[PDB]
Amino acid sequence: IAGRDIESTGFAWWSGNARLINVSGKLLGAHVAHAGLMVFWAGAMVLFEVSHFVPEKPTYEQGFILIQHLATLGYGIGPGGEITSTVPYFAVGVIHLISSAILGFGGIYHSLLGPDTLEESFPFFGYDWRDKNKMTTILGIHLCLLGLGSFLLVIKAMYLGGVYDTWAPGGGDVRYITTPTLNPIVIFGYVFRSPFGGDGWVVSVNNMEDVIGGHIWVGILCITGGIWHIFTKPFAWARRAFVWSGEAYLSYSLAAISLMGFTAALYSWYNNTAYPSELYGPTGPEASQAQAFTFLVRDQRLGANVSSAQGPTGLGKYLMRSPSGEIIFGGETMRFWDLRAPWVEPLRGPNGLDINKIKNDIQPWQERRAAEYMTHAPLGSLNSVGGVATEINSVNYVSPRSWLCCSHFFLAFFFLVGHWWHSGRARAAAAGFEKGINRANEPVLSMRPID
Amino acid sequence: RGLFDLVDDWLKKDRFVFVGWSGLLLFPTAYLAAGGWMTGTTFVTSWYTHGLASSYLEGCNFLTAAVSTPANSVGHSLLLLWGPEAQGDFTRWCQIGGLWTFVALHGAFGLIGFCLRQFEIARLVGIRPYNAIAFSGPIAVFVSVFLLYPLGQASWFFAPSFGVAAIFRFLLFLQGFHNWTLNPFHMMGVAGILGGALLCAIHGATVENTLFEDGDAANTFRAFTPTQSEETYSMVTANRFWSQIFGVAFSNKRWLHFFMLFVPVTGLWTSSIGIVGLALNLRAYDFVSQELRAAEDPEFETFYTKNHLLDEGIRAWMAAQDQPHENFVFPEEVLPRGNAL
Amino acid sequence: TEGTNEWFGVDDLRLLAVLFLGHWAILSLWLGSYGDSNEDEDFFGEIDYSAR
Amino acid sequence: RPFSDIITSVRYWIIHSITIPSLFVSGWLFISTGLAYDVFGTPRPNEYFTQDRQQVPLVNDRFSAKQELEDLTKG
Amino acid sequence: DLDEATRTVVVDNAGNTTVLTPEQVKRGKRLFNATCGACHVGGITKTNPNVGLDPEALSLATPRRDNISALVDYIKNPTTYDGLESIAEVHPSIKSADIYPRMRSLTDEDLYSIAGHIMLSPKIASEKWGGGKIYY
Amino acid sequence: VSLWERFCAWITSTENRLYIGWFGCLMFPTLLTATSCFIIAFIAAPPVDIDGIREPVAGSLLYGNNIISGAVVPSSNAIGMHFYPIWEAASIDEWLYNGGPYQLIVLHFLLGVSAYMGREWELSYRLGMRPWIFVAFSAPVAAASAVFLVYPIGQGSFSDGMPLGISGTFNFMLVFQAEHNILMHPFHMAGVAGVFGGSLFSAMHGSLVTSSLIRETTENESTNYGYKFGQEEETYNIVAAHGYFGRLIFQYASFNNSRALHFFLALWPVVGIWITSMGISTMAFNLNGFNFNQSVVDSQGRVINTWADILNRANLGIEVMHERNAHNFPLDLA
Numbered sequence A: 001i002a003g004r005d006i007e008s009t010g011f012a013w014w015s016g017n018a019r020l021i022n023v024s025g026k027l028l029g030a031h032v033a034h035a036g037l038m039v040f041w042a043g044a045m046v047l048f049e050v051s052h053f054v055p056e057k058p059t060y061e062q063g064f065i066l067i068q069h070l071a072t073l074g075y076g077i078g079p080g081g082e083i084t085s086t087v088p089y090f091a092v093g094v095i096h097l098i099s100s101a102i103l104g105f106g107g108i109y110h111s112l113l114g115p116d117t118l119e120e121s122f123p124f125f126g127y128d129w130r131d132k133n134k135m136t137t138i139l140g141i142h143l144c145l146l147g148l149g150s151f152l153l154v155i156k157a158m159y160l161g162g163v164y165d166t167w168a169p170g171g172g173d174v175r176y177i178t179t180p181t182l183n184p185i186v187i188f189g190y191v192f193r194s195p196f197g198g199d200g201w202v203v204s205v206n207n208m209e210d211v212i213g214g215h216i217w218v219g220i221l222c223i224t225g226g227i228w229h230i231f232t233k234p235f236a237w238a239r240r241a242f243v244w245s246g247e248a249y250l251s252y253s254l255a256a257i258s259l260m261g262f263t264a265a266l267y268s269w270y271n272n273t274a275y276p277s278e279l280y281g282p283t284g285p286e287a288s289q290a291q292a293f294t295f296l297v298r299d300q301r302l303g304a305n306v307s308s309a310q311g312p313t314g315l316g317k318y319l320m321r322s323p324s325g326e327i328i329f330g331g332e333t334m335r336f337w338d339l340r341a342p343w344v345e346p347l348r349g350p351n352g353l354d355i356n357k358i359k360n361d362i363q364p365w366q367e368r369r370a371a372e373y374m375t376h377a378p379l380g381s382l383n384s385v386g387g388v389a390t391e392i393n394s395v396n397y398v399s400p401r402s403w404l405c406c407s408h409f410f411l412a413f414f415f416l417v418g419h420w421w422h423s424g425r426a427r428a429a430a431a432g433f434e435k436g437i438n439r440a441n442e443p444v445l446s447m448r449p450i451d
Numbered sequence B: 001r002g003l004f005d006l007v008d009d010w011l012k013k014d015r016f017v018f019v020g021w022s023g024l025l026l027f028p029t030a031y032l033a034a035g036g037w038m039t040g041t042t043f044v045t046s047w048y049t050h051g052l053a054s055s056y057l058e059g060c061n062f063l064t065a066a067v068s069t070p071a072n073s074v075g076h077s078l079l080l081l082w083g084p085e086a087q088g089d090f091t092r093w094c095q096i097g098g099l100w101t102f103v104a105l106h107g108a109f110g111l112i113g114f115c116l117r118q119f120e121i122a123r124l125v126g127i128r129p130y131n132a133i134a135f136s137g138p139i140a141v142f143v144s145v146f147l148l149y150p151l152g153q154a155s156w157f158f159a160p161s162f163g164v165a166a167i168f169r170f171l172l173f174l175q176g177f178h179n180w181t182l183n184p185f186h187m188m189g190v191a192g193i194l195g196g197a198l199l200c201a202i203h204g205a206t207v208e209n210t211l212f213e214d215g216d217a218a219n220t221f222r223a224f225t226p227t228q229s230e231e232t233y234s235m236v237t238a239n240r241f242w243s244q245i246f247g248v249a250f251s252n253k254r255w256l257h258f259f260m261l262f263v264p265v266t267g268l269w270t271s272s273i274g275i276v277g278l279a280l281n282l283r284a285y286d287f288v289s290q291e292l293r294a295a296e297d298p299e300f301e302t303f304y305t306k307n308h309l310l311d312e313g314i315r316a317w318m319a320a321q322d323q324p325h326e327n328f329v330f331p332e333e334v335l336p337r338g339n340a341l
Numbered sequence C: 001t002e003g004t005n006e007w008f009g010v011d012d013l014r015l016l017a018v019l020f021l022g023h024w025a026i027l028s029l030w031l032g033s034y035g036d037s038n039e040d041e042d043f044f045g046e047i048d049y050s051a052r
Numbered sequence D: 001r002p003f004s005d006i007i008t009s010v011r012y013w014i015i016h017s018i019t020i021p022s023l024f025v026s027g028w029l030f031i032s033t034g035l036a037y038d039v040f041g042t043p044r045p046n047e048y049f050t051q052d053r054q055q056v057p058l059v060n061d062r063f064s065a066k067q068e069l070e071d072l073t074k075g
Numbered sequence E: 001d002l003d004e005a006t007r008t009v010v011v012d013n014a015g016n017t018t019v020l021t022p023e024q025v026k027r028g029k030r031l032f033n034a035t036c037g038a039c040h041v042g043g044i045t046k047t048n049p050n051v052g053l054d055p056e057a058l059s060l061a062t063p064r065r066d067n068i069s070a071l072v073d074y075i076k077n078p079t080t081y082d083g084l085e086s087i088a089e090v091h092p093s094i095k096s097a098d099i100y101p102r103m104r105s106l107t108d109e110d111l112y113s114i115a116g117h118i119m120l121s122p123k124i125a126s127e128k129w130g131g132g133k134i135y136y
Numbered sequence F: 001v002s003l004w005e006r007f008c009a010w011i012t013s014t015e016n017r018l019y020i021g022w023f024g025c026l027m028f029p030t031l032l033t034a035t036s037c038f039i040i041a042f043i044a045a046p047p048v049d050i051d052g053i054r055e056p057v058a059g060s061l062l063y064g065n066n067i068i069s070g071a072v073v074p075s076s077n078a079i080g081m082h083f084y085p086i087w088e089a090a091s092i093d094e095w096l097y098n099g100g101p102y103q104l105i106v107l108h109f110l111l112g113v114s115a116y117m118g119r120e121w122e123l124s125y126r127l128g129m130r131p132w133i134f135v136a137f138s139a140p141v142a143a144a145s146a147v148f149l150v151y152p153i154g155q156g157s158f159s160d161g162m163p164l165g166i167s168g169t170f171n172f173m174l175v176f177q178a179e180h181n182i183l184m185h186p187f188h189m190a191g192v193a194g195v196f197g198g199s200l201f202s203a204m205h206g207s208l209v210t211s212s213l214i215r216e217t218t219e220n221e222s223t224n225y226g227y228k229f230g231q232e233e234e235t236y237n238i239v240a241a242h243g244y245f246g247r248l249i250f251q252y253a254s255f256n257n258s259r260a261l262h263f264f265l266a267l268w269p270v271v272g273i274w275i276t277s278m279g280i281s282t283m284a285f286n287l288n289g290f291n292f293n294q295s296v297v298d299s300q301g302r303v304i305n306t307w308a309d310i311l312n313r314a315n316l317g318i319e320v321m322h323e324r325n326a327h328n329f330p331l332d333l334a
């Protein structure tokens, strides 16, 4: 049991995977076995969702999160969010479930039986953590694979079937993206804009031509950055600034994956382009504009001239003006005036909502679309009671947007705590006082009196 | 030798659970208070006192089960099982809320018996009785909330019931009817409790991050002996850290640990004073100068006056259900609503 | 205009000038210590204690 | 006697393989036979409201509380 | 305590009365909460609160909707509150079941159970059904 | 010997009265900006139209408030989550009308208290300490970012952020209970166990050290003069405190390890405040607390109320009265 108890490692059982820091072969097996777990869950969860699928309900009313990712890719999906087959969703889960046995075998092979260190007999795969040239090679190899995977989405959208475009003319449907936006001022205009309202940093991508053109650039950058890190060694300013240890590299990824987790959460909450509302339900902004649209249509049929109808406060009851001047929906939903849902954009001119198009040409599909979005707002309880916190127990519903955003906001915060844990520790373990203060030469004692 | 001395020798014998003379009071009364609470939340209803389901027999979970207070009609009766309301009938005793006064009175003598236990053990171990002094905080909370607050009110009905969501009702009842957040004695209580949890976290993390290297393991828990004389952490480094981070640091370990005692106990004692005031409805309800200004100037709005409209909503929408003995029939036209809600 | 999609909020070229001039000023001080530093001097630790 | 050496001895599990399931069954039979409703006066799901009383029964008298409850629990 | 007397609901416009079987009651609550409950929770209408499912509002529709047969006729063919134009394109119905895929697998026995749940619920909860948040 | 190296040596110097460091280059300008703007806005700031309905709420002392009722009122609902700096406001009076000072204070406070956290890492590194004091401070930082930033992001408006005032805080709490049922959320329950337990363990650990102090003083002088700053010896009998608490409950339930005990003092409130910070952050996206309204049902089908239903009647009273002119439609979806 050498290296597997506290007397040889100095680590207890609860920090027991910290014994894997300097044994590269077992650390390899830990990562491919955990890779086998994520591929297992991807297979098992979407088979659960295929098995529990009913055709009468929309896919956001059934508590699903994974078949809407495949429907956005274009499988089994029809016009307007119609799910047609569920045989492509079954197949994706079988490939992911069968492949987890291969990753699960290579996990427990390299963990229990394979060589504990790769440096002696497999010099291409062996590494020291302090080898800055070898560590940029692993980073560069895995960067080219992320560029190749970003090009797979481009290949899927441009050549192999297309992706679901909720903005498509004729209704939302699967569409080949023929002209992706390659202009770097447009594409990096998402990366360098404000994160705040109206701007909405990277979440505010609003058409599929900017999505696929962004994944071309991400595919270009990751491949040219992968070849860059394979070929080169870190510059002298990089070598002065980082800690070159295994726990330090972990804490760099923990900070980066926490920033991505906060971003993917707000994708789920705000974006209705890559997360179409026919699949994920309406967004928070979308559902309250659907309410103001519903009672505008309700009261205009009763003969209200809704553009002149004064509210209780003196603002517009139905139509008011945004602080920039656009004609928006009135009420408390004036905060969500940046909402650009696909069922309300047919009524927008350059000045905001067009008044004659609201008076004359409001289509019955729009009144239906706003009606189910009003009644399936992302508001619900932990026991999945739909509605506000004062609602009674009859509706069994929580939006998938609310499940996706809350879980990944929970996870992204704790992974930022992991960045703080592991970067504080790796900085102190590199300097050599992570086990405590030396009694012989305490640093504060050899300092000036502090006053 | 003497018969008192043989019993005093047997009660203070070092065994698995120390009994002592205080265990003659604590172990009966705390067992009946805990066991009476488990009996009420599992089996006993609130259908005749409050009109509620409050046991696991009726479908409540752990959050919504309670031992509810007696009916308002019995007043401040002790509700003895042999008393003039139940008259020995155990079933009728549980239905009028007799288990509430069972749990509250045997729980009151359990807290007396537990604080006497802290005095008794400290006298035998030979230390100072500061843990019994610190337990006066929780005793002052229980006495003032569960006993003194309903005694100043109309009946035991307005006491907190012994449940999770029943306590949550008591929190919102005292906002709507008493404006208890506005009370400066609750505010001193919030400062002592959040200040106590702060002092727990800072002192816990400062010791753990100013530890001395006393072993070679990265696991630093092994490098401590319970009988060692050296300090296990650097007070000079810990004082140096907080003097430059915060400007002010502790320099005395004795004053530090007394301060960890002082802050939450003062918070429980100051909040017990204001809840004795709410027993007599001597509440911090209104700032009259803002109420007089907002009466004659109908645009003067503060977050203060917005909170009074929330309280008038609470007092009208919950009063028919929360005081069912009173037969409050409010028509929908008299219930205060905002627009569209 | 605040809801418009400007790079770093730069709507006037005054703001682009002070971003460059501010960042290049501390860069020029920092190059007073880390310019004239050899590129081929490596180390095999987790941390380097090279010079000042 | 220490604790963990008791619960790992097989004599402990000879005694408590009979006594623990017999108490778990006896707690189950306390509910299954409906005895717990009669001991504590808890309403069964049938008997929150009766045919005569469609309202929530409250006790409005202190000293005839035993007799008022007997009239509310006759049906 | 669900006797035959509470389960006795008016079945048609002439005033004849039928008893719902316990299968009609249990399945009718399940189907109503799934199909209709997002807009019709507790008997209110969320998207048009002037037109509720309480039996007084059903009494004042111009085809009087206080029956099992008249409620089933509304699900197969929905009209306005005065019955003058059809609202099948904005209400879930068998007439627009190509529009609403939730109505696509529904027998007439299922509509009988759903109409049973709308008729039985005021007999159980009188003012709570269609009463809104005042009786929550 | 260069100018930048002499500036770096002063910034990272542990001989300054307050440590500055490189996080203090972000901490000191942002927090002094937010402190200057808070004091001026709390004393003298005109009323703010918070709900976007041109009903301005007074928050400052010169407009008739006191310490309890005074607040820095959140931004306008018409602004929403839009960035509202001074230079996007066409006059300072328009910026003051629309709740501009709230966005300036909150964004400089949250930047400055994250830099306060990194400053706590930084001094521990220059002093040779173990690093993780700033991980404990991450629990109140996550709580401040939940009620000031994250809950505005999920609700889509800085108007739903917590007001910078005493009575505005209670208004924030009550509306949150009506709209999210935070009391029935288990993450607030773990937070209450974090602060009730944390102040229990503070009073417990503080009692047992004070109970077992060693004789070093007389009856005339204070007991705290038995400790000398910089002494090497232990100042209290930890065997006597363990023998007391081991007889108070039972022997196996007491820490004899002082390092394990002080770790438990750090972990219990910090994990409890971490969890309740992720309750506010997940009720930001309306994943609310437990809804047990009308869940107990008798044989006929009638609803038997519970204590959750009486709690629901108090939630109904807040929500029909909160923001009483702001709503036009029957559901508060914001």
Ligand code: CLA
Residues within 6 Å of the ligand: A003, A004, A005, A012, A013, A014, A015, A016, A017, A018, A019, A020, A023, A026, A027, A029, A030, A031, A033, A034, A100, A101, A102, A104, A105, A108, A111, A112
């Ligand atoms: C993601 C989960 C995960 C993974 C992949 C690992 C992986 C590893 N751990 Mg870690 N560990 C984990 C979580 C994980 N751990 C957790 C949660 C804890 C706290 C309890 C620990 C505490 C811990 C300690 C204290 C130690 C490790 C050690 C190890 C390493 C060797 C294990 C070994 O040799 O013992 C042999 C293990 C067994 C004989 C158990 C057999 C279990 C098998 C794998 C189950 C397979 C079932 C599966 C269905 C089979 C599918 C087969 C099919 C695909 C063909 C290995 C790389 C050791 C180490 O670091 O060595 C240097 C070590 O000392 N772990």
Ligand code: CLA
Residues within 6 Å of the ligand: A013, A014, A015, A016, A017, A018, A250, A254, A414, A415, A416, A417, A418, A419, A421, A422, A425
């Ligand atoms: C990919 C991310 C990642 C990786 C590879 C590591 C790896 C490591 N961590 Mg780090 N850490 C991380 C993220 C990560 N961590 C995060 C996100 C946090 C904040 C929570 C931390 C906080 C942390 C601390 C405080 C410590 C480590 C330690 C370690 C080392 C040993 C871990 C071990 O054996 O635990 C074995 C696993 C267990 C004992 C089980 C953990 C108990 C979990 C919480 C119970 C599960 C609850 C629930 C079912 C799941 C969570 C809720 C769910 C909804 C998400 C190992 C190098 C230890 C170390 O520093 O060694 C040097 C250590 O003391 N980590």
Ligand code: CLA
Residues within 6 Å of the ligand: A028, A032, A102, A103, A105, A106, A107, A109, A110, A114, A115, A118, A122, A125
């Ligand atoms: C991905 C992480 C990973 C890495 C870095 C390694 C690395 C290694 N493995 Mg391990 N292993 C893994 C996963 C991994 N393996 C998996 C998933 C399995 C189950 C199939 C195994 C089962 C396994 C066995 C049984 C053995 C090894 C051995 C080895 C060592 C020798 C390499 C070799 O055989 O020549 C190089 C190999 C090739 C050039 C052939 C490559 C063929 C593969 C299938 C191509 C993969 C396709 C594509 C790149 C990836 C598609 C999937 C992807 C999208 C996820 C080397 C250290 C040997 C060893 O440790 O000896 C003691 C050994 O006997 N591995």
Ligand code: CLA
Residues within 6 Å of the ligand: A136, A139, A143, A221, A222, A223, A224, A225, A226, A228, A229, A232, A233, A234, A235, A238
């Ligand atoms: C998984 C993604 C990933 C990761 C972890 C890394 C990690 C690293 N990169 Mg690499 N890189 C990547 C993807 C990645 N890269 C991709 C996709 C590209 C193509 C765009 C590059 C192109 C690249 C270059 C050109 C360099 C690095 C460098 C580095 C190393 C330190 C710099 C740093 O990260 O500070 C983060 C710092 C910033 C985000 C700001 C940097 C600002 C620079 C220094 C201004 C200098 C001006 C210069 C002309 C650049 C023009 C752009 C400028 C206007 C911003 C570090 C190992 C540095 C290195 O040491 O290479 C060997 C380096 O010089 N990377």
Ligand SMILES: CC(C)=CCC/C(C)=C/CC/C(C)=C/CC/C(C)=C/CC/C(C)=C/CC/C(C)=C/CC/C(C)=C/CC/C(C)=C/CC/C(C)=C/CC1=CC(=O)C(C)=C(C)C1=O
Residues within 6 Å of the ligand: B027, B030, B031, B034, F200, F201, F202, F204, F205, F206, F208, F209, F238, F241, F242, F245, F246, F249, F253, F254, F255, F256, F261
């Ligand atoms: C004969 C007849 C007729 C038969 C009838 C049968 C009959 C008689 C039955 C009666 C049986 C009956 C009920 C008796 C049992 C008695 C009984 C237990 C009743 C009480 C009821 C009850 C349920 C009690 C439970 C309450 C309880 C014990 C809770 C405590 C829980 C617990 C484990 C707490 C520990 C908390 C904790 C870890 C705190 C430590 C943290 C802290 C800051 C410590 C500080 C600290 C600690 C140190 O350690 C040292 C060193 C120092 C420095 C220091 O700072």
Ligand SMILES: CC1=C(/C=C/C(C)=C/C=C/C(C)=C/C=C/C=C(C)/C=C/C=C(C)/C=C/C2=C(C)CCCC2(C)C)C(C)(C)CCC1
Residues within 6 Å of the ligand: A033, A034, A036, A037, A040, A047, A094, A097, A098, A100, A101, A103, A104, A105, A107, A108, A111
């Ligand atoms: C190392 C280690 C570890 C780990 C482990 C792991 C992580 C593993 C993994 C594993 C795995 C990851 C596994 C997997 C498996 C899988 C499988 C085995 C599969 C199978 C499949 C099947 C059989 C299917 C079938 C089917 C079909 C085909 C169709 C449909 C139906 C069904 C689904 C039935 C632990 C933690 C313990 C600790 C110690 C050490």
Ligand SMILES: CC1=C(/C=C/C(C)=C/C=C/C(C)=C/C=C/C=C(C)/C=C/C=C(C)/C=C/C2=C(C)CCCC2(C)C)C(C)(C)CCC1
Residues within 6 Å of the ligand: A186, A187, A188, A190, A191, A202, A205, A210, A211, A212, A213, A214, A215, A217, A218, A241
């Ligand atoms: C796909 C897509 C897209 C695209 C995207 C992109 C193109 C991206 C990019 C991205 C990017 C481009 C990013 C960047 C990032 C960065 C970062 C994140 C940074 C960081 C930094 C750091 C971390 C640093 C630090 C430091 C300092 C500050 C000091 C010194 C030290 C150190 C170095 C540590 C779009 C939207 C169009 C659409 C949709 C889809």
Ligand SMILES: CC1=C(/C=C/C(C)=C/C=C/C(C)=C/C=C/C=C(C)/C=C/C=C(C)/C=C/C2=C(C)CCCC2(C)C)C(C)(C)CCC1
Residues within 6 Å of the ligand: B031, B032, B034, B035, B036, B037, B038, B039, B102
């Ligand atoms: C009232 C009364 C009485 C009675 C008393 C007693 C004697 C009682 C007892 C009772 C008891 C004494 C009971 C108990 C019960 C208990 C239970 C029922 C418990 C449960 C628990 C649970 C279920 C928990 C859970 C868990 C676990 C197990 C582990 C993991 C975690 C957790 C925490 C989740 C008498 C006769 C005096 C007469 C007068 C009146």
Ligand code: OEX
Residues within 6 Å of the ligand: A332, F077, F155, F157, F159, F160, F175, F179, F322, F323, F326, F332, F333, F334
């Ligand atoms: O801002 Mn503050 O509180 Ca949230 O819900 Mn809608 O918006 Mn307003 O009302 Mn309710």
Ligand SMILES: [Fe+2]
Residues within 6 Å of the ligand: B203, B207, B257, F205, F209, F262
């Ligand atoms: Fe201590």
